[PDB]
Amino acid sequence: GHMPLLSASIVSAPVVTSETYVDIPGLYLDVAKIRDGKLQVILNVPTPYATGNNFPGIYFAIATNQGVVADGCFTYSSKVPESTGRMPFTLVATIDVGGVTFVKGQWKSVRGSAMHIDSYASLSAIWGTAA
Amino acid sequence: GHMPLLSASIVSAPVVTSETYVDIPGLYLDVAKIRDGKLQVILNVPTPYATGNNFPGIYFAIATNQGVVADGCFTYSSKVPESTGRMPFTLVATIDVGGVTFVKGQWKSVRGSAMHIDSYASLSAIWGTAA
Amino acid sequence: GHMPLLSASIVSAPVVTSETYVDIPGLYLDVAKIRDGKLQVILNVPTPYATGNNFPGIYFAIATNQGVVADGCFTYSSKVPESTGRMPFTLVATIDVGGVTFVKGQWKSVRGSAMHIDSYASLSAIWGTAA
Numbered sequence: 520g521h522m523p524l525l526s527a528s529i530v531s532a533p534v535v536t537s538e539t540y541v542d543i544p545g546l547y548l549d550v551a552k553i554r555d556g557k558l559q560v561i562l563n564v565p566t567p568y569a570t571g572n573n574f575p576g577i578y579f580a581i582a583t584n585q586g587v588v589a590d591g592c593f594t595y596s597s598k599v600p601e602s603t604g605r606m607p608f609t610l611v612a613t614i615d616v617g618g619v620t621f622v623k624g625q626w627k628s629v630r631g632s633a634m635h636i637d638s639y640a641s642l643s644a645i646w647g648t649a650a
Numbered sequence: 651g652h653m654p655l656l657s658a659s660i661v662s663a664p665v666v667t668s669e670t671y672v673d674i675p676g677l678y679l680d681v682a683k684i685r686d687g688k689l690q691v692i693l694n695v696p697t698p699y700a701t702g703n704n705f706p707g708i709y710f711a712i713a714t715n716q717g718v719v720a721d722g723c724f725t726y727s728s729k730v731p732e733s734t735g736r737m738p739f740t741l742v743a744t745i746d747v748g749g750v751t752f753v754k755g756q757w758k759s760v761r762g763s764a765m766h767i768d769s770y771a772s773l774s775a776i777w778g779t780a781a
Numbered sequence: 782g783h784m785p786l787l788s789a790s791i792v793s794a795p796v797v798t799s800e801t802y803v804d805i806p807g808l809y810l811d812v813a814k815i816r817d818g819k820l821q822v823i824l825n826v827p828t829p830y831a832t833g834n835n836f837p838g839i840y841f842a843i844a845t846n847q848g849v850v851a852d853g854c855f856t857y858s859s860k861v862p863e864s865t866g867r868m869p870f871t872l873v874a875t876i877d878v879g880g881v882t883f884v885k886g887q888w889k890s891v892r893g894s895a896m897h898i899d900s901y902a903s904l905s906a907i908w909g910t911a912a
């Protein structure tokens with residue numbers, strides 16, 4: 520149709536620790552399957568947790584073929600929290616589509632944390648034009 | 651008009667405890683008042699808190715006539731926190747409108763928590779098409 | 782173009798304490814540079830922290846020429862946390878453009894907190910119509 524909404528959602532990912540950004544499997548939009556204008560991209564990870572022994576947390580990024588375009592993180596406020604609580608995370612970025620063929624979510628450990636998704640997470644994009 | 655933006659906002663809700671998803675009163679979009687294509691729905695509860703004595707928290711869901719389409723939660727990282735801090739929460743889901751007549755926000759207790767909204771919260775939807 | 786996506790992003794702001802809402806520098810959309818219909822506005826501050834000695838936190842607002850349209854906050858759950866963890870924050874509001882010429886992000890201290898952004902934050906708007 521004429522006003523594309525793109526969405527990918529997952530409910531889990533294998534638990535991993537990574538020093539560097541690695542794809543969150545399943546959070547991937549094939550944009551080439553839009554060639555001009557803009558995409559407002561939301562990465563929504565509403566119920567993540569991190570396990571670790573040095574102020575755990577998770578960095579998240581939005582990436583295209585051109586690499587990371589935006590990132591951010593949550594961290595706990597204790598070195599070893601009593602419980603690794605669920606720390607809702609959302610990241611919003613707008614990309615110029617004019618060598619972008621895909622958008623994806625990525626994550627990376629804070630201080631060696633293991634990264635946990637065990638429920639709904641999504642990557643969404645709304646197509647628009649420049650002003 | 652030709653590119654509908656839907657929005658509902660509230661500033662409070664009666665405090666309740668619920669084992670199961672119950673509507674957050676006022677976060678409701680009448681979609682039937684769109685019949686094809688997609689809605690990107692955001693549930694934004696930026697300043698909630700939970701009270702309780704067993705690692706309190708709140709689950710939130712986006713639901714249509716067809717039930718819950720996405721959910722997630724925040725939880726505290728202490729069994730009884732010193733203070734029940736404000737834990738911003740956002741949830742994003744894209745729905746195929748092709749027996750959807752309404753979208754609403756819902757919530758449910760984590761471990762018997764009382765659920766508190768006492769400031770701005772919103773439910774938003776942007777209409778688009780399949781790709 | 783015919784379906785404008787507006788975006789502004791920053792990676793830092795001078796650290797300040799404020800009793801009242803002050804602009805977050807750089808999170809500003811010139812809307813007048815749209816005169817009818819709606820804007821869905823997202824303020825995304827994914828990696829803020831607050832420093833303070835009385836349950837620190839940050840309030841955030843979306844404002845237009847007409848003032849604040851929505852706000853919310855995060856707060857820590859300890860009076861003086863062991864570490865001031867990163868507390869992702871998102872705020873979503875829909876505005877009727879019919880004396881709006883700009884949209885901006887603002888912030889304000891919780892209990893005298895110093896306010897910290899030292900990585901990506903964004904303010905985004907998608908143009909639509911009434912239903």
Ligand SMILES: CC(=O)N[C@@H]1[C@@H](O[C@@H]2O[C@H](CO)[C@H](O)[C@H](O)[C@H]2O[C@@H]2O[C@@H](C)[C@@H](O)[C@@H](O)[C@@H]2O)[C@H](O)[C@@H](CO)O[C@H]1O
Nearest residue numbers: 567568601602603604605704705707723724725726727760
């Ligand atoms: C409070 C806490 O951290 N509990 C951990 C247990 O996690 C809970 O497990 C039960 C099933 O027995 C439920 O699945 C519950 O949803 C789990 O709690 C959720 O996840 C944890 C990690 C926290 O984020 C909590 O706030 C959230 O509600 C866990 O099964 C055990 C062993 O792995 O550790 C407990 O500390």
Ligand SMILES: CC(=O)N[C@@H]1[C@@H](O[C@@H]2O[C@H](CO)[C@H](O)[C@H](O)[C@H]2O[C@@H]2O[C@@H](C)[C@@H](O)[C@@H](O)[C@@H]2O)[C@H](O)[C@@H](CO)O[C@H]1O
Nearest residue numbers: 698699732733734735736835836838854855856857858891
């Ligand atoms: C630190 C704390 O939890 N304070 C609680 C009190 O809540 C504050 O009340 C004052 C008015 O006296 C303000 O309204 C302030 O905004 C309230 O704090 C906010 O809400 C609490 C629940 C926390 O989320 C806090 O971080 C947030 O800023 C509360 O009135 C009393 C009794 O109910 O308990 C205090 O612990």
Ligand SMILES: CC(=O)N[C@@H]1[C@@H](O[C@@H]2O[C@H](CO)[C@H](O)[C@H](O)[C@H]2O[C@@H]2O[C@@H](C)[C@@H](O)[C@@H](O)[C@@H]2O)[C@H](O)[C@@H](CO)O[C@H]1O
Nearest residue numbers: 573574576592593594595596629829830863864865866867
């Ligand atoms: C755990 C913690 O709070 N550490 C604080 C230090 O902040 C870390 O500094 C290192 C560089 O040495 C990195 O830049 C790291 O990313 C910083 O941690 C990040 O920011 C702090 C404020 C927390 O939000 C943390 O969770 C987050 O990962 C800081 O440099 C020093 C002195 O200012 O204080 C430490 O407590």
